Amino acid sequence: SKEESREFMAIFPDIVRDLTDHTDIPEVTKRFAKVLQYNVPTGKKTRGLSTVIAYKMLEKPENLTPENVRLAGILGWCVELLQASLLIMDDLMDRSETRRGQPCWYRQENVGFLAINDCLHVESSLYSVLRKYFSHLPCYVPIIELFHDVNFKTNMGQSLDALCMKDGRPILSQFTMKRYSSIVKYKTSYYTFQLPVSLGMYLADMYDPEQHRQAKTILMEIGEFFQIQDDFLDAFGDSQKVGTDIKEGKCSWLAVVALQRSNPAQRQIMEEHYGRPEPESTQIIKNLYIELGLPATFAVYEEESFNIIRTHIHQISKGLPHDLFFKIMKKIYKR
Amino acid sequence: FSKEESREFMAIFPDIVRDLTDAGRHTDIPEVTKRFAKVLQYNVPTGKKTRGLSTVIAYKMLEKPENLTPENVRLAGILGWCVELLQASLLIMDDLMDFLAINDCLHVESSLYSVLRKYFSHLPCYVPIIELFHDVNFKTNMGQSLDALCMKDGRPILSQFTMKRYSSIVKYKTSYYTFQLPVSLGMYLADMYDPEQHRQAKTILMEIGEFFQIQDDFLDAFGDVGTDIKEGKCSWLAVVALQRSNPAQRQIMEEHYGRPEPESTQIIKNLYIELGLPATFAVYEEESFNIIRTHIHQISKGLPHDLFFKIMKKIYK
Ligand SMILES: CC(C)=CCC/C(C)=C/COP(=O)(O)OP(=O)(O)O
Ligand SMILES: [Mg+2]
Ligand SMILES: [Mg+2]
Ligand SMILES: [Mg+2]
Ligand SMILES: [Mg+2]
Numbered sequence: 265s266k267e268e269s270r271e272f273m274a275i276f277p278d279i280v281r282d283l284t285d286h287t288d289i290p291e292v293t294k295r296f297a298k299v300l301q302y303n304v305p306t307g308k309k310t311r312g313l314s315t316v317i318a319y320k321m322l323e324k325p326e327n328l329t330p331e332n333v334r335l336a337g338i339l340g341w342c343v344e345l346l347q348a349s350l351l352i353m354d355d356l357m358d359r360s361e362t363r364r365g366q367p368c369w370y371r372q373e374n375v376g377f378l379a380i381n382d383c384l385h386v387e388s389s390l391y392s393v394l395r396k397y398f399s400h401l402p403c404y405v406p407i408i409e410l411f412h413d414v415n416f417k418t419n420m421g422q423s424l425d426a427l428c429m430k431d432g433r434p435i436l437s438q439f440t441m442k443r444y445s446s447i448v449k450y451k452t453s454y455y456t457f458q459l460p461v462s463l464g465m466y467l468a469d470m471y472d473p474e475q476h477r478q479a480k481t482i483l484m485e486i487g488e489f490f491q492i493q494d495d496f497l498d499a500f501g502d503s504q505k506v507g508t509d510i511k512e513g514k515c516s517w518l519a520v521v522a523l524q525r526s527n528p529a530q531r532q533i534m535e536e537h538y539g540r541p542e543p544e545s546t547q548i549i550k551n552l553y554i555e556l557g558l559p560a561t562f563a564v565y566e567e568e569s570f571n572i573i574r575t576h577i578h579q580i581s582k583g584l585p586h587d588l589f590f591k592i593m594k595k596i597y598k599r
Numbered sequence: 600f601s602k603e604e605s606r607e608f609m610a611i612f613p614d615i616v617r618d619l620t621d622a623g624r625h626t627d628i629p630e631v632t633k634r635f636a637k638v639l640q641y642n643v644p645t646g647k648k649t650r651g652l653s654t655v656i657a658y659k660m661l662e663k664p665e666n667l668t669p670e671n672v673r674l675a676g677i678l679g680w681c682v683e684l685l686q687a688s689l690l691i692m693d694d695l696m697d698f699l700a701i702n703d704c705l706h707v708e709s710s711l712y713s714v715l716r717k718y719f720s721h722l723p724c725y726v727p728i729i730e731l732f733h734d735v736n737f738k739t740n741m742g743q744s745l746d747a748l749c750m751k752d753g754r755p756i757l758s759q760f761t762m763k764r765y766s767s768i769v770k771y772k773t774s775y776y777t778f779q780l781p782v783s784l785g786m787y788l789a790d791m792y793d794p795e796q797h798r799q800a801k802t803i804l805m806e807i808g809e810f811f812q813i814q815d816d817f818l819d820a821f822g823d824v825g826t827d828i829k830e831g832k833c834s835w836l837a838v839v840a841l842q843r844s845n846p847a848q849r850q851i852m853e854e855h856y857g858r859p860e861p862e863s864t865q866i867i868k869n870l871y872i873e874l875g876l877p878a879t880f881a882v883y884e885e886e887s888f889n890i891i892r893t894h895i896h897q898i899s900k901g902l903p904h905d906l907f908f909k910i911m912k913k914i915y916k
């Protein structure tokens with residue numbers, strides 16, 4: 265929606281002023297404004313806007329004042345602040361060149377390993393936003409605790425992902441569906457799906473831990489498909505982002521399923537060519553994925569997962585609106 | 600710190616590891632949980648825990664003697680370990696910039712907020728304590744960045760080396776988390792929330808923090824192995840050297856400060872000797888001590904002066 269997107273984007277400049285406008289150190293506050301302006305407001309803002317929409321479908325229609333919708337928007341920007349911090353750090357860790365076409369922050373002149381500090385700074389900053397706007401509301405402490413908990417869980421996700429690599433070479437014996445599912449849950453699903461919905465619920469004064477647990481069950485399932493679809497399109501999606509999962513030696517759903525279905529000779533091709541810099545090595549792995557019928561396998565998974573998740577949504581108890589979870593399903597599966 | 604204080608503090612650490620690495624919960628990710636136990640065990644509990652133990656001492660000297668139960672002194676010890684978790688994340692980040700992964704510093708920092716939630720979420724001091732940690736984290740990061748703005752393309756920017764910028768770096772990068780945080784935590788646990796009491800403490804603790812770092816800066820070059828010169832750090836010695844330098848002495852700093860060759864380090868030290876930085880530190884040490892002793896004696900708003908004298912005596916020796 266034009267009105268929702270514009271109202272949301274209009275909040276960002278206020279959050280920069282809140283965090284940067286410490287009058288004795290103007291040179292660092294000016295630099296932090298640039299850190300925020302480069303890394304936080306560019307691209308889709310899907311997680312941020314999903315927080316606003318989640319709130320709009322959870323709150324009683326009589327309580328949906330512009331004031332409250334703005335508070336939802338500020339929570340959305342706190343999600344985008346958390347993500348910005350995570351992606352600054354991940355880019356340094358993965359030594360990536362670009363993110364969404366933009367050169368990675370750490371590559372910019374006179375940053376490098378100072379990106380570590382900028383990561384921590386950006387993550388810490390969202391708690392200052394929460395204090396200014398929410399310190400007087402009952403949802404304050406639950407929201408602070410949710411952000412700190414999700415940060416901790418995301419770090420477990422990132423560390424689990426790193427235990428699939430040694431000396432910058434993939435450990436293919438680690439590429440199991442159980443480890444993949446755990447990586448997606450902790451590294452992606454909590455901050456991408458649980459965080460926006462739980463923020464919406466808290467702002468709507470929904471504190472029942474069972475309601476949050478029932479939301480989690482369905483959101484972790486949708487989250488798994490989301491990342492599996494993302495992994496699939498990296499290799500088989502119409503380029504005209506250019507996919508580099510194979511070169512980077514990522515524990516992707518494609519690599520996991522490839523190893524499940526491979527005969528010994530096919531396993532040897534993964535051992536020899538997976539996570540190598542040569543473009544020839546990327547094409548050999550892609551050719552193996554085609555040979556193992558991974559496009560057909562994804563097509564079956566997409567149809568089956570959709571049906572299973574839709575069934576689980578129909579069985580949701582409590583005051584949780586099924587509407588919200590069907591709406592999330594629609595945007596992800598695009599149907 | 601007394602034997603009993605030290606031993607009962609150290610005894611808390613294994614509990615905090617079990618609390619954070621999910622002992623009792625039966626986790627779906629044991630491999631990475633076991634790794635985090637090792638990150639904590641290897642990086643957090645080793646050497647002197649002076650910030651952690653200072654939090655316990657601060658609480659013991661602010662709380663009414665009747666309220667000093669083993670249970671409350673243990674809580675003070677847990678706040679102390681949260682300061683040591685912050686210290687550990689900051690040290691990891693310094694090790695990285697010069698087994699451990701890059702996100703371990705973010706993880707360790709995040710873990711202190713899990714410890715705070717577990718032990719303090721139902722106490723009145725909860726919101727003030729988490730807000731103090733949030734604010735100190737932010738300020739420490741600002742200090743870290745201000746320090747980095749004294750360096751461009753691997754070279755020190757000597758025009759940035761002013762006493763104004765140095766004082767700001769020490770205040771934001773070190774003094775807030777090293778001196779303000781332990782005392783304010785003690786005060787909050789003792790249900791002392793009055794902003795004027797906190798501001799009275801801050802004034803003295805920012806002054807102690809400045810001597811602490813200036814003494815550290817001095818001993819790096821003139822102690823009995825320091826690499827501040829080689830690393831081109833914005834140290835008190837370099838700041839004062841540039842204040843006192845004639846144009847020829849400035850050119851020696853321009854040419855030889857922040858160079859890897861050990862000969863450049865000895866040239867800078869020779870220049871520091873020539874500029875009378877030892878004598879200058881001796882004057883600063885005497886004058887700062889007399890000013891800080893004065894302010895501690897003048898401390899009001901119902902604060903005990905003996906807490907701050909103990910901190911002062913530990914730093915100045
Ligand atoms: C604790 C931290 C730092 C978490 C990082 C979370 C994250 C979404 C990383 C990107 O994943 P990726 O590296 O597998 O993919 P890409 O970089 O291509 O988006
Ligand atoms: Mg990564
Ligand atoms: Mg990456
Ligand atoms: Mg990428
Ligand atoms: Mg991807």
Ligand SMILES: [Mg+2]
Nearest residue numbers: 815816819827
């Ligand atoms: Mg030093």
